[PDB]
């Protein structure tokens, strides 16, 4: 196994995949590390389990059918996996933690939003369907557009928004286009 966490890409208190290399803070994976189980599947393995056992998963999906879904375990474990990616970013740092709002010229937004809230929300099965999840992500970077305005530090929004739209098309088999 890999000697360092695969999110945070620091050592310390590692548990280690069964089913491969990869290793992981406990707080670092999502869900967290589980108590027991061995052997132990990292998401990443849970999540090629997925693909394996239903290939044609892969086909491409129109993203208003994919946000209408209901969060049925493989659906909670997707967004689980997108949430983890996005956290797999060093720029996550930013948006992890309750943010505030004190700069001259800006407003504070109306409903604040970050990923250790989403964390939470995914945790307590607060979402009922995928659009849920994908309207809280995709508000933390709109959140930090507005408020920045001609900041350069806007931009800091605009990649890890990035980083997250790759990672929903790539797993949720969204339609590839131009
Ligand atoms: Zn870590
Ligand atoms: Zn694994
Ligand atoms: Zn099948």
Redesign the pocket.
Known sequence: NSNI??????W?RLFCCDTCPRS??E??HIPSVEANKNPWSCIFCRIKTIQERCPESQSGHQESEVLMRQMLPEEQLKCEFLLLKVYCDSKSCFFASEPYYNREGSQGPQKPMWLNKVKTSLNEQMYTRVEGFVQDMRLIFHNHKEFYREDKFTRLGIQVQDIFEKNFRNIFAIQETS
């Open positions: 966490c695969e999110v945070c890409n620091k310390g992981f803070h707080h670092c």
